[PDB]
Amino acid sequence: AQKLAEEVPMDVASYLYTGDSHQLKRANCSGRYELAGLPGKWPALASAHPSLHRALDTLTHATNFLNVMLQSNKSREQNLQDDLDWYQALVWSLLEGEPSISRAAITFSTQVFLQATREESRILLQDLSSSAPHLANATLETHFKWSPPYLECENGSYKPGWLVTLSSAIYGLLVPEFRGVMKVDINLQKVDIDQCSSDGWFSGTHKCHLNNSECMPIKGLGFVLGAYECICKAGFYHYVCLPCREGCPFCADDSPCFVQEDKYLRLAIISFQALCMLLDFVSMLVVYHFRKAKSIRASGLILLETILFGSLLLYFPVVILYFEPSTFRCILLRWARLLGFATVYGTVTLKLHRVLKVFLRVMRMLAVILLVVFWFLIGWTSSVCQNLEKQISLIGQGKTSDHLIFNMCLIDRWDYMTAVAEFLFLLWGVYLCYAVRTVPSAFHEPRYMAVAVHNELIISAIFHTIRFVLASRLQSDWMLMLYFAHTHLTVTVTIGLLLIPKFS
Amino acid sequence: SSVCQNLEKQISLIGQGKTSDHLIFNMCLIDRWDYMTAVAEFLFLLWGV
């Protein structure tokens, strides 16, 4: 409607859309404009500047004045002596009242009329029909007469200004009739208009509807189009308002907000991780086949398969942290860590305790610490889920280093003291191995395990250290190498020292 | 540690009251930890028994 309604006035669209001197400084008009529909629905001073009210006020004052005056009894029609002076001074003061009332006429015949227009400072006035006086439209009516914006031209180029008129028909004086027509016209061209108003002058926000849309319009200049600036709300800007590439505002570009990946790297990483877990399972089967010469008695078949189930319980964290951080990730992480940890190293150290008694009842020591670890997962798990899944803190976090973003599983002071557990439960065995210093068998099994223990203490301490130190400025790739590296190092090691000799 | 490093000042507290019908009463209170505490005491003395 409004869009198709723009193909209305040729050599005026510069005066309409640009509101420009192309249709004004040089464009043959030979006709005044007409807002009888080029306005809003009708605004009728319901969508009003105050100036409308001021104009109507002076109008109605003069209207009542002349009506009651003409309603004076015995209407003489005495236009001879001085009544002409009264009407002349009246129209002078009239057009002198409004600084933007350009021309105005007043006719009274119960063809000739008084008129005046602002030349520079005086009311260029003469007893001749001018400004406005529509006896024709008053007879057609046979209230006041609203009017239309215009242009300073009837058979000429439309000069500066677009003229909106106010007009009325002089009610006569014991009945009434049409006895005159008085009307003025003011410049409806320096009149601020609103394309994005809720209701205004034919407000159409046809530049920013929804697509990250806001209209932050150009408020008051005058009767000019293209005066409704729009804003591109939280996305890109290339009359283009666009989204972001992601839920990541400040999209001066539509660039991405995440780290660059190294997928090809990650494939082989995971494959090699499966390699080690394959070796784990495989060697468990190796055990359950070849169980009948020295190793079987000195080293429990049971206790071996314990350790391997440990390693297979253990290697998960890697395959985890290739995948994305959901909160359900982090918890499995804590699960696998502590379970593989205790389940292996308990049996390890207990063998040595038994050795030490031979110097001078296994599982009824081990199931204890497995118990305590069960308890722990439960306690901490519930204390985060039931009471912190929703309320206060967030675990899976989108943390940013510098330009980019990355998700990750986060920490808590809990896992600090957990690492410290690792410290001490090894350090026991370390005391153990040290003072048990010279003690025989055809294996140097104690030297083997003691090696494991010194290894893991120093090195798993380090791994936990270099994760907790600077996690808040990590990418999601350097970390993975860390996990891969330390777990392969220490634990493939601590497999091999036990398994290697027990073939040859 | 959980208290003294996270929820000391930031978001939560313990000095805390509820109401019977429309009247006030403050106290300390609980979370899941005291639950697990109890269950440990239980099992410990079970072994003793």
Short mmCIF file of N, CA and C in Angstrom, two decimals, chain A residues 339-437:
data_model
loop_
_atom_site.label_atom_id
_atom_site.label_comp_id
_atom_site.label_asym_id
_atom_site.label_seq_id
_atom_site.Cartn_x
_atom_site.Cartn_y
_atom_site.Cartn_z
N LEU A 339 38.42 -44.14 40.85
CA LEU A 339 38.28 -45.58 40.92
C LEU A 339 39.48 -46.34 40.35
N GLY A 340 40.00 -45.94 39.19
CA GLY A 340 41.14 -46.66 38.66
C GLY A 340 42.33 -46.48 39.56
N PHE A 341 42.42 -45.30 40.14
CA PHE A 341 43.50 -44.99 41.03
C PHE A 341 43.55 -45.97 42.19
N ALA A 342 42.49 -45.99 42.99
CA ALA A 342 42.53 -46.80 44.18
C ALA A 342 42.57 -48.27 43.83
N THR A 343 41.76 -48.67 42.86
CA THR A 343 41.65 -50.09 42.59
C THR A 343 42.95 -50.70 42.15
N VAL A 344 43.83 -49.93 41.53
CA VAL A 344 45.14 -50.41 41.19
C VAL A 344 46.05 -50.35 42.39
N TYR A 345 46.14 -49.20 43.00
CA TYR A 345 47.30 -48.98 43.83
C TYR A 345 47.11 -49.59 45.19
N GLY A 346 45.86 -49.82 45.57
CA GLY A 346 45.60 -50.61 46.74
C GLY A 346 46.23 -51.99 46.65
N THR A 347 45.87 -52.74 45.61
CA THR A 347 46.45 -54.07 45.47
C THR A 347 47.96 -54.00 45.40
N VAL A 348 48.48 -52.99 44.72
CA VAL A 348 49.92 -52.85 44.66
C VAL A 348 50.50 -52.80 46.05
N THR A 349 50.05 -51.86 46.84
CA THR A 349 50.74 -51.65 48.09
C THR A 349 50.51 -52.82 49.03
N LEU A 350 49.36 -53.48 48.91
CA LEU A 350 49.07 -54.56 49.84
C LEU A 350 49.97 -55.74 49.61
N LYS A 351 50.31 -56.00 48.35
CA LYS A 351 51.30 -57.03 48.10
C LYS A 351 52.55 -56.78 48.90
N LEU A 352 52.95 -55.53 48.97
CA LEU A 352 54.18 -55.22 49.67
C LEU A 352 54.01 -55.40 51.15
N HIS A 353 52.87 -55.00 51.67
CA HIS A 353 52.61 -55.25 53.09
C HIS A 353 52.72 -56.74 53.40
N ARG A 354 52.23 -57.58 52.48
CA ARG A 354 52.28 -59.02 52.71
C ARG A 354 53.72 -59.52 52.65
N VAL A 355 54.48 -59.00 51.69
CA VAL A 355 55.92 -59.22 51.65
C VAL A 355 56.54 -58.90 53.00
N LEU A 356 56.16 -57.77 53.56
CA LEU A 356 56.82 -57.33 54.76
C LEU A 356 56.51 -58.25 55.91
N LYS A 357 55.36 -58.93 55.85
CA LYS A 357 55.05 -59.87 56.92
C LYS A 357 55.74 -61.20 56.72
N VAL A 358 55.90 -61.62 55.47
CA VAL A 358 56.77 -62.77 55.21
C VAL A 358 58.17 -62.51 55.73
N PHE A 359 58.60 -61.26 55.72
CA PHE A 359 59.86 -60.88 56.36
C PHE A 359 59.93 -61.36 57.80
N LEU A 360 58.79 -61.44 58.48
CA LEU A 360 58.76 -61.63 59.92
C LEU A 360 57.89 -62.82 60.29
N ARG A 361 43.91 -62.55 53.67
CA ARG A 361 43.60 -61.27 54.28
C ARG A 361 44.18 -60.16 53.43
N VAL A 362 43.63 -60.04 52.22
CA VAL A 362 44.00 -59.02 51.25
C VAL A 362 42.76 -58.19 50.94
N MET A 363 41.74 -58.88 50.47
CA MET A 363 40.57 -58.19 49.97
C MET A 363 39.82 -57.55 51.12
N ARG A 364 39.96 -58.11 52.32
CA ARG A 364 39.37 -57.50 53.50
C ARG A 364 40.22 -56.34 54.00
N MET A 365 41.23 -55.94 53.22
CA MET A 365 41.78 -54.61 53.32
C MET A 365 41.37 -53.75 52.15
N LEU A 366 41.18 -54.34 50.98
CA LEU A 366 40.97 -53.53 49.78
C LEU A 366 39.55 -53.00 49.63
N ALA A 367 38.57 -53.86 49.86
CA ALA A 367 37.18 -53.46 49.73
C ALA A 367 36.85 -52.30 50.64
N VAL A 368 37.63 -52.11 51.71
CA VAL A 368 37.50 -50.94 52.55
C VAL A 368 37.63 -49.67 51.73
N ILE A 369 38.77 -49.50 51.09
CA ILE A 369 39.04 -48.21 50.48
C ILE A 369 38.19 -48.05 49.23
N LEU A 370 37.83 -49.16 48.60
CA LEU A 370 36.82 -49.05 47.56
C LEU A 370 35.51 -48.52 48.11
N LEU A 371 35.11 -49.00 49.28
CA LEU A 371 33.96 -48.44 49.98
C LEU A 371 34.05 -46.93 50.14
N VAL A 372 35.18 -46.44 50.67
CA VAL A 372 35.26 -45.04 51.02
C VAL A 372 35.15 -44.20 49.76
N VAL A 373 35.67 -44.72 48.66
CA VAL A 373 35.61 -43.97 47.42
C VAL A 373 34.19 -43.95 46.86
N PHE A 374 33.46 -45.07 46.96
CA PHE A 374 32.04 -45.06 46.61
C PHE A 374 31.31 -43.95 47.34
N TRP A 375 31.36 -44.02 48.67
CA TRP A 375 30.82 -42.99 49.55
C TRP A 375 31.13 -41.61 49.03
N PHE A 376 32.38 -41.39 48.65
CA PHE A 376 32.76 -40.05 48.28
C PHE A 376 32.08 -39.59 47.02
N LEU A 377 32.14 -40.40 45.96
CA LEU A 377 31.43 -40.02 44.74
C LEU A 377 30.01 -39.64 45.07
N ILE A 378 29.37 -40.42 45.93
CA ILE A 378 27.97 -40.18 46.19
C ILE A 378 27.80 -38.82 46.84
N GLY A 379 28.62 -38.55 47.83
CA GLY A 379 28.40 -37.36 48.63
C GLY A 379 28.58 -36.12 47.81
N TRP A 380 29.72 -36.03 47.15
CA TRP A 380 30.03 -34.86 46.36
C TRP A 380 29.06 -34.71 45.20
N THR A 381 28.73 -35.83 44.57
CA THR A 381 27.84 -35.81 43.43
C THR A 381 26.50 -35.20 43.79
N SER A 382 25.86 -35.74 44.82
CA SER A 382 24.62 -35.14 45.27
C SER A 382 24.78 -33.68 45.67
N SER A 383 25.92 -33.30 46.27
CA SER A 383 26.00 -31.95 46.79
C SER A 383 26.12 -30.95 45.68
N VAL A 384 26.53 -31.40 44.49
CA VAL A 384 26.57 -30.48 43.36
C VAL A 384 25.25 -30.53 42.59
N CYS A 385 24.70 -31.72 42.40
CA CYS A 385 23.51 -31.82 41.56
C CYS A 385 22.27 -31.29 42.27
N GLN A 386 21.89 -31.92 43.38
CA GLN A 386 20.67 -31.57 44.11
C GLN A 386 20.62 -30.09 44.47
N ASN A 387 21.77 -29.47 44.70
CA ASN A 387 21.84 -28.16 45.34
C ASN A 387 22.66 -27.14 44.58
N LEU A 388 23.33 -27.51 43.49
CA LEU A 388 24.12 -26.57 42.71
C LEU A 388 23.97 -26.77 41.20
N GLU A 389 23.20 -27.76 40.78
CA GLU A 389 22.87 -27.89 39.36
C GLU A 389 22.07 -26.72 38.84
N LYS A 390 21.35 -26.04 39.71
CA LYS A 390 20.35 -25.06 39.35
C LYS A 390 20.53 -23.74 40.04
N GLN A 391 21.02 -23.75 41.27
CA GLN A 391 20.84 -22.62 42.15
C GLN A 391 21.80 -21.50 41.81
N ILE A 392 23.09 -21.75 41.99
CA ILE A 392 24.05 -20.69 42.21
C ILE A 392 25.16 -20.78 41.18
N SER A 393 25.94 -21.86 41.14
CA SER A 393 27.13 -21.98 40.25
C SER A 393 26.83 -22.79 38.98
N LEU A 394 27.66 -22.58 37.95
CA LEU A 394 27.63 -23.29 36.64
C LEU A 394 28.99 -24.00 36.52
N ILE A 395 29.02 -25.25 36.06
CA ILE A 395 30.28 -26.05 36.01
C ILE A 395 30.91 -26.04 34.61
N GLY A 396 30.12 -26.29 33.51
CA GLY A 396 30.49 -26.44 32.12
C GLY A 396 30.59 -24.95 32.01
N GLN A 397 31.66 -24.30 31.48
CA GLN A 397 31.77 -22.82 31.41
C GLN A 397 32.29 -22.49 30.00
N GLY A 398 31.91 -21.32 29.48
CA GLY A 398 32.34 -20.82 28.16
C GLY A 398 33.18 -19.78 28.87
N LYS A 399 34.51 -19.90 28.74
CA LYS A 399 35.53 -19.01 29.37
C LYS A 399 36.22 -18.56 28.08
N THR A 400 36.74 -17.32 28.06
CA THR A 400 37.45 -16.73 26.90
C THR A 400 38.89 -16.39 27.32
N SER A 401 39.86 -16.54 26.42
CA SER A 401 41.30 -16.25 26.66
C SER A 401 41.41 -14.82 26.13
N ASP A 402 41.45 -14.65 24.80
CA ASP A 402 41.56 -13.31 24.17
C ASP A 402 40.61 -12.79 23.07
N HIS A 403 40.15 -13.59 22.10
CA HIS A 403 39.39 -13.03 20.99
C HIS A 403 38.39 -14.18 20.99
N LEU A 404 38.90 -15.40 21.07
CA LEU A 404 38.05 -16.59 21.08
C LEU A 404 37.43 -17.16 22.35
N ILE A 405 36.61 -18.19 22.20
CA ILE A 405 35.95 -18.82 23.33
C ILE A 405 36.19 -20.33 23.32
N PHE A 406 35.93 -20.98 24.44
CA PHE A 406 36.11 -22.41 24.58
C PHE A 406 35.33 -22.87 25.78
N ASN A 407 34.70 -24.02 25.64
CA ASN A 407 34.09 -24.67 26.78
C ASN A 407 35.11 -25.52 27.51
N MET A 408 34.78 -25.90 28.73
CA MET A 408 35.60 -26.83 29.50
C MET A 408 34.85 -27.26 30.76
N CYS A 409 35.24 -28.43 31.26
CA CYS A 409 34.89 -28.84 32.62
C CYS A 409 35.79 -28.12 33.60
N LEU A 410 35.17 -27.54 34.61
CA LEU A 410 35.88 -26.77 35.61
C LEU A 410 36.11 -27.62 36.85
N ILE A 411 36.66 -26.99 37.88
CA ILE A 411 37.29 -27.65 39.00
C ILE A 411 36.50 -27.38 40.26
N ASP A 412 37.04 -27.89 41.36
CA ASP A 412 36.80 -27.29 42.65
C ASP A 412 37.83 -27.77 43.66
N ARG A 413 37.91 -27.04 44.77
CA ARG A 413 38.89 -27.22 45.84
C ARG A 413 38.92 -28.68 46.29
N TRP A 414 37.77 -29.33 46.13
CA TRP A 414 37.67 -30.77 46.26
C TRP A 414 38.83 -31.50 45.58
N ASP A 415 38.99 -31.31 44.28
CA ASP A 415 39.95 -32.14 43.58
C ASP A 415 41.38 -31.78 43.99
N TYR A 416 41.60 -30.57 44.53
CA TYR A 416 42.89 -30.28 45.15
C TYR A 416 43.19 -31.30 46.22
N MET A 417 42.32 -31.37 47.22
CA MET A 417 42.64 -32.28 48.31
C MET A 417 42.59 -33.73 47.84
N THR A 418 41.93 -34.00 46.73
CA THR A 418 41.95 -35.35 46.17
C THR A 418 43.34 -35.72 45.65
N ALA A 419 43.93 -34.82 44.87
CA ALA A 419 45.31 -35.01 44.43
C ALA A 419 46.21 -35.30 45.61
N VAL A 420 46.00 -34.54 46.68
CA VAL A 420 46.78 -34.72 47.89
C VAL A 420 46.62 -36.13 48.42
N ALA A 421 45.44 -36.71 48.24
CA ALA A 421 45.28 -38.11 48.57
C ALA A 421 46.29 -38.94 47.82
N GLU A 422 46.47 -38.60 46.55
CA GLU A 422 47.34 -39.44 45.73
C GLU A 422 48.76 -39.41 46.25
N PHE A 423 49.23 -38.20 46.51
CA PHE A 423 50.47 -37.95 47.22
C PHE A 423 50.67 -38.95 48.35
N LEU A 424 49.72 -39.00 49.29
CA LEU A 424 50.03 -39.68 50.53
C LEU A 424 49.92 -41.18 50.40
N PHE A 425 48.86 -41.65 49.75
CA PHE A 425 48.68 -43.07 49.58
C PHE A 425 49.83 -43.69 48.81
N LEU A 426 50.53 -42.91 47.99
CA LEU A 426 51.76 -43.44 47.45
C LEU A 426 52.89 -43.38 48.45
N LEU A 427 52.93 -42.32 49.24
CA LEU A 427 54.10 -42.07 50.06
C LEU A 427 54.27 -43.15 51.10
N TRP A 428 53.15 -43.76 51.47
CA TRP A 428 53.17 -44.92 52.35
C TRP A 428 54.00 -46.03 51.76
N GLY A 429 53.66 -46.44 50.54
CA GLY A 429 54.45 -47.42 49.85
C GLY A 429 55.89 -47.00 49.68
N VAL A 430 56.15 -45.71 49.65
CA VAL A 430 57.52 -45.28 49.44
C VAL A 430 58.37 -45.57 50.66
N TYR A 431 57.91 -45.12 51.83
CA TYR A 431 58.47 -45.58 53.10
C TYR A 431 58.68 -47.06 53.07
N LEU A 432 57.63 -47.75 52.63
CA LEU A 432 57.60 -49.19 52.64
C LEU A 432 58.80 -49.73 51.88
N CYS A 433 58.89 -49.40 50.59
CA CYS A 433 59.95 -49.87 49.71
C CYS A 433 61.33 -49.46 50.20
N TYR A 434 61.47 -48.23 50.68
CA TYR A 434 62.78 -47.76 51.11
C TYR A 434 63.34 -48.64 52.20
N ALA A 435 62.65 -48.72 53.32
CA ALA A 435 63.25 -49.46 54.42
C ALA A 435 63.29 -50.95 54.11
N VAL A 436 62.38 -51.43 53.27
CA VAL A 436 62.45 -52.81 52.84
C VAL A 436 63.42 -52.86 51.66
N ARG A 437 64.67 -53.08 51.97
CA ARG A 437 65.75 -52.52 51.18
C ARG A 437 66.60 -53.57 50.52
#
